[PDB]
Point group: C4
Chain length 137, copies 4
Amino acid sequence: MHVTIEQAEKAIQAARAKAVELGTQMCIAIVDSGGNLKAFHRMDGAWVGSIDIAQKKAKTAVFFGMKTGQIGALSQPGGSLYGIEHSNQGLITFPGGIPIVDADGEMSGAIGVSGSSVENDDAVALAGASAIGDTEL
Amino acid sequence: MHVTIEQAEKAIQAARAKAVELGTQMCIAIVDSGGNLKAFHRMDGAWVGSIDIAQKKAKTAVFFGMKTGQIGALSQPGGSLYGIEHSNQGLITFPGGIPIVDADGEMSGAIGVSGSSVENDDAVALAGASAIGDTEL
Amino acid sequence: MHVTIEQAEKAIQAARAKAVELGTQMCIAIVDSGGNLKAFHRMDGAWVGSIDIAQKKAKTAVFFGMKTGQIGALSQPGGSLYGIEHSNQGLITFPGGIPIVDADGEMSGAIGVSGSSVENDDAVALAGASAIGDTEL
Amino acid sequence: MHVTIEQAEKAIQAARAKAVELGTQMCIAIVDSGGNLKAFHRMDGAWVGSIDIAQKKAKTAVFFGMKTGQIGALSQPGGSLYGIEHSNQGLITFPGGIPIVDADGEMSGAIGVSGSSVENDDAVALAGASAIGDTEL
């Protein structure tokens, strides 16, 4: 199953509402199971650099079926995945990207959020993915 | 507001005069609030590798509303932004990029400086940005 | 000697057999002595990000006549090859790439595997390369 | 002054001679003061990955007027130039790139060497640069 645009826009609205609640201005990306962009929302006032980061987080999460920070935990110096960010045109491996998981437990896409602390990025990401499905495989 | 070319050239000449005072030969870039190049000055004798770095520093500063070294403080191994430099076609996160801030407190662009020690890069950047506004949000 | 398509496909089959035995879904790439793609197999269910990583691993191994993790042992902070991954359009230096070495001891190509833990990647890579030659120079 | 093709080839021959003395197979690159390729020699049997590295080493040296490893000493985690390798389409900051310095003390280009240990890379580069000028500014 592929994330629909209706589902993607509902995730963005849930993410946007959390971001406001937290006092943040976020870029919010949704990609499909191939990493191809499905929807994007740049909140007024969000950092211009967060545009690319939010999309790379969404792509990273769906490319590996993991939350983005779970990869960064493995890609430190001495880590088993050291250097992995060079692949796939550039990954982002700090928090803010989460898989979208359908009721079957199949990954249908991913959300990527950037614009604030990575903790706030992850909270907004989680609200968006939680609005339309599960988040863990 | 957007930085004007008159402001950009005034910032460049102030940076140039500080660089001379310090015995340095610098590349000095100004970008607008979208990261697009507004003005650039390579001093005679400046390292060729500083051309790209000065421009990437200005872009990085304006993309995140921060001095570039403030991002590098967060992107070390174990840091919350570890790996961020892979985004946005390449960031520079050591000192030398500073936001240009208007009287309304709005970021209108950014300056970037490369060609010496990062401390002199930052001193020259600051002289340039202070000639045309504030530097902090 | 160059790796033939018959050898490349035999290696892929031996790698796929190992992957299934270990319970994994892998991308498997074979490149020739110039780093040019010779064969590729993405098992059903394999992570999409493993497509690029498997090819970069194979390229990395043939480009230096070493298993990929042997390079990463030398490219940690403080290591003699720190930063090598920025070369050659992006290298991968954790396990999963192995040279293919013909009976004369000449390197004819390399295999690259991605999709599970790096330990399983290397076991799958080994099974495939072992099926058509030696693995050490 | 610019390095001439006569100087570049004399430097290449001196490097090849030292590489043979050491039992190594090297790629040897000469770039002009702009970083543009002037001459290149891949010894028979040199690692294919050393083609790009030798050229990036020469580019890096001329771009900053330093031996490449002097930059890597500064670009470790915690270092003032951490992440500099992302600039200028990819630098190499381990040993093997050395500036070429004419009699007037002007840098006219650079040599870059890859194919063995970084220590042999640097010894071959030095042999080649020494043949046509000084190596320090």
